Amino acid sequence: VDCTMYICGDSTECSNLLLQYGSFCTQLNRALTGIAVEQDKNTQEVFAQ
């Protein structure tokens, strides 16, 4: 997920207001990346044997 876009992208004014919350969604872009990585690890653990 692109949280900038999810909340409201392609808008100067939305970005300026998203930023008043700091890392509020940055941490979720991070959490989702971690989940997707874990899903590739699961595939490898099960099939690349």
């Binding site: 692109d2 900038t4 876009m5 992208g9 392609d10 872009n29 990346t33």
Partner: protein, 49 residues
Amino acid sequence: PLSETKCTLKSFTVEKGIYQTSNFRVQPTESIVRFPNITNLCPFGEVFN
């Protein structure tokens, strides 16, 4: 791109791998405004002319 990686990771050195540093978006080139077809031009001229 390597400096994108270094500031994203808050590091002056980078380990082997892939890191997400940004989000790519194409912006509009032109604006399309289409209002419904007008056949019904208003007869103001019948009073003015």
